[PDB]
Amino acid sequence: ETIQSNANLAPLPPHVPEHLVFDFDMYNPSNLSAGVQEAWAVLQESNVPDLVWTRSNGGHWIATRGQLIREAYEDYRHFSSESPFIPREAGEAYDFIPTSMDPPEQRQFRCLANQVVGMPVVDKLENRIQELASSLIESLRPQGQCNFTEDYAEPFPIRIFMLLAGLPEEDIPHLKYLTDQMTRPDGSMTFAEAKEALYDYLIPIIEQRRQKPGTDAISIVANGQVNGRPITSDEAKRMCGLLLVGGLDTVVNFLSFSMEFLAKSPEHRQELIERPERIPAASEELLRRFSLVADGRILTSDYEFHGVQLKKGDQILLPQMLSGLDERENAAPMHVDFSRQKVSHTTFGHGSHLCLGQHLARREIIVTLKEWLTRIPDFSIAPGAQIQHKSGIVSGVQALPLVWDPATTKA
Ligand code: HEM
Ligand SMILES: CC(=O)Nc1ccc2ccc3cccc4ccc1c2c34
Ligand SMILES: CC1(C)[C@@H]2CC[C@@]1(C)C(=O)C2
Ligand SMILES: [K+]
């Protein structure tokens, strides 16, 4: 409550009015045990203003409502991506391309990143995605149990990504640890250190692949043209770093929230079993209700936004997760309804940095749901297990022990 009682609170800057203070900690929200999305949505209760200042993590603004999150993501002139992670040290070290660049300079790099993860790449890979989902799920099916995070939610998206990037599967533990320190730091490695370690891994590979290219995403990037010239090794490195983080730490977390929900809700399962054709619309509703990303921007100048004086250099967290949980975007937002006429969300971001991997993500989710519900239509949480979530730039599920009767499973 005061800096005296919590040594991790920063002194309130003199431009912030006291009535705007709400000390939310994005890496450990006080309500976390109710679930991560629930923990974030306390920011939308009636006692909280649209725009609040937290003294946690160095002190920063949080926009709490979809309209303000959308406005701020649109207005890159005041809200710059140059420092898009909280705390300030992490935002300062973050130098990934195109995400750390404001329009119009992100353009050519966005162009090149799209060539390696966009829709034509997803369609070319769809057979491989179905192959891997089917193979993993058939291998779990007769067992009647799994640890979902490690038996499926990690290896399924990550192996697809390492296949796309032409990286060996035995490097997964090393890379996954690093990507995870960036989004959900345990406190033993700064963002800068995790990035430096990711860059040390990538640098020799990128050199090799500029000398002897393959057909993999890393060789395509490292040998691209941007801005009228060959991309440099360093630029390709700053792009590939971002690619790894999207490949290893996005869909991986989302699949656990979704499968946890399905394990906890037989009625929703039954609706997808009985009407498989509803799977794509159901995926979008899950992408809304179990949205999981929160990054932000930094103020380029003093700026009064919705009646609130923002100062240059002030950081603002713009939680992508919150737009679709906002009751002003969706009625009864904590309820999952696969037939919503309009699933309003900003789960994949908004504006000029809108997600390039979203098509890969949707295919992976859709394929996972269709293949899981076909082979293992009936499952549940391990009895007595209480599911814990974790919170950060990308939120996650600590463990998801599932069980089923093998007799109920199908080929
Ligand atoms: C459920 C899975 C995913 C979610 C929730 C998600 C979310 C997002 C969000 C919120 C942004 C914008 C961040 C900002 O404005 O600073 C974004 C951008 C991006 N994402 Fe996704 N993402 C997902 C999957 C992926 C995958 C699988 C990849 C690639 C393998 C990927 C690559 C990108 C890239 C390259 C950008 C930067 C686009 C730009 O700066 O122009 N993402 N992601
Ligand atoms: C190279 C370039 O045009 N930059 C572009 C940036 C981002 C894109 C995101 C999704 C896309 C789907 C289909 C065609 C696209 C063409 C161009 C795209 C682009 C495309
Ligand atoms: C916020 C993101 C999900 C987006 C893709 C990876 C991520 C952690 C970034 O750094 C940009
Ligand atoms: K930076």
Ligand SMILES: [K+]
């Ligand atoms: K409404």
